């Protein structure tokens, strides 16, 4: 595929690289979980508060 239809793979994986592309979507998706007061942040804060 890389030898033959490279451009198609480029478009599918990253597209424009701003909102289209699987990796581009993953960027925002994972950043959502990693953001401050994210899901993990809330879980950790709740455990900390409970320990009090």
């Amino acid at each position: 595929v890389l030898k033959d239809n490279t451009a198609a793979a480029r478009e599918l994986l990253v597209g424009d690289g701003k909102e289209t592309g699987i990796t581009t979507k993953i960027a925002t998706e994972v950043k959502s979980y990693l953001a401050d007061d994210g899901i993990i942040d809330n879980a950790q804060d709740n455990v900390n508060a409970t320990l009090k």
């Binding site: 033959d4 239809n5 490279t6 451009a7 198609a8 478009e11």
Partner: protein
């Protein structure tokens, strides 16, 4: 050029900078007399009379 190259079908387009303030489209297929091309346009006669 982009809409040609994206297809990744074996025919590719490159833009050559003629002198200055001028450019020329350059198209090439893979080697072989069997790769000789016939080309035309649909919809736009202005462009067909230029590129056919």
């Amino acid at each position: 050029r982009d809409a040609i190259n994206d297809a990744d079908s074996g025919i590719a387009a490159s833009i050559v900078k003629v002198k200055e303030n001028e450019f020329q489209l350059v198209l090439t297929a893979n080697s072989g007399t069997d790769n000789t091309m016939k080309i035309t346009v649909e919809g736009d006669t202005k462009l067909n009379d230029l590129l056919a």
